[PDB]
Symmetry: C2
Subunit: 249 residues, 2 copies
């Protein structure tokens, strides 16, 4: 018996107006007759269209990134701009931003804290690389990442936080986690939360699996006890995202 | 008898749906009696609103950044996405991106080249810091920056290129003119005199409705990339100053 599951679509840097409209239409026509929060994280460009067309009662829209405040930050989008635009969910600290776009543990923590303070529901991403899972220090890496985030939050703030575990070490080497391995990473995270934040928060916290999930593999991943849904990349651009939602039954 | 001037509004990371709509209404109601390309560079989020509402026949919309291709780049917007969305202008290599967000000379050059290949009009930004200027290396720095860009481009590509000179550190008309002349001279020398004659070099320092007229008077100034003042009614005066 778990907290409410989340099925989150990370469209990453993809989509045309037509391909995304067809996806949205599919989502809109889909019966979801169980309790789940579905999330569509579109590009900043596609937020207007997604707001306009996404009408399914079980779906909210999310941004894939942001900075804390408006200002002289050419090219960037701030939390007040998203809030003014009616967007109340955000994915922060994706492994790609940590790798490509200079986001350290602290920068992620600061973005998460600013987003919570501003009233967002936040999917905060953490996860070890292969270099680190090899030196016998998976635990060290992901717990250090979450500690950085926690440092800047109050106990009450965790109600608005969702953790997404990304096994970056698996990313594009064709190799995928066993459900046992996914469970172990999630259990390690929850145990840390129970221990440093509190058993209450830890029981309620959604920890989403953020490795490569598809329509075939989602059900047995969700069966694991500390898995509370998914942050989905590639398959979220496909009709099979509907099967992934159904797998959180 | 310069090339067609450009008055470009760099809104940076600013705006509400309300405040930006008010501004757009002002721009729409404005009479502009000369040939000038006005450009509104809004945040990605406000592109849809600006596309719908902005109707002045002398205005186009621009993005303030992009990456070259669609893919697994969470948080970013690619050139194909913008092109699908009907955005044909883009600002690239702005000092804040160079400063904060890892855009080296080569990265800027690659983005610029990809945007031209993709069919975009590109406002490519170059400019030296305060320390660079004070030590006397304005010329080395900005010519190195434009050389990196030119390295990734072909002659015919310069038709879709606009240079914004953005001294990162108020510039007298004389100091602005010197930087613009230095840039044009390099372009004449490397690409051809015909291309340098046609090239817009926009002044992208701190421009206001009050100082824009005398800056535009200089031989090699072809308009403006405007920061703070572009969020204000006085942007209309800045447009008028390109007469």
């Amino acid at each position: 018996s778990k907290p409410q599951p989340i099925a989150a679509a990370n469209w990453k840097c993809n989509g045309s107006q037509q391909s995304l409209s067809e996806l949205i239409d599919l989502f809109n026509s889909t019966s979801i007759n169980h309790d789940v929060q579905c999330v569509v994280a579109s590009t900043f460009v596609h937020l207007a269209m997604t707001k306009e067309r996404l009408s399914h009662p079980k779906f909210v829209i999310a941004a894939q990134n942001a900075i804390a405040k408006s200002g002289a930050f050419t090219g960037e989008v701030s939390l007040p701009i998203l809030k003014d635009f009616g967007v109340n969910w955000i994915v922060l600290g994706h492994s790609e931003r940590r790798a490509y776009y200079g986001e350290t543990n602290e920068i992620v923590a600061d973005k998460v804290a600013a987003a919570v303070a501003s009233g967002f529901m936040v999917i905060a991403c953490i996860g070890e690389t292969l270099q680190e899972r090899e030196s016998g220090r998976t635990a060290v890496v992901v717990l250090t990442q979450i500690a950085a985030i926690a440092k800047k939050l109050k106990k009450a703030d965790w109600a608005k936080v969702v953790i997404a575990y990304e096994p970056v070490w698996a990313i594009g080497t064709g190799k995928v986690l066993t459900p046992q391995q996914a469970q172990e990473a999630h259990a390690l995270i929850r145990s840390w939360v129970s221990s440093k934040i509190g058993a209450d928060v830890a029981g309620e916290l959604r920890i989403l699996y953020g490795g490569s999930v598809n329509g075939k593999n989602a059900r047995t991943l969700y069966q694991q006890r500390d898995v509370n849904g998914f942050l989905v990349g590639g398959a979220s651009l496909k009709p099979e995202f509907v099967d992934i939602i159904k797998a959180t039954q």
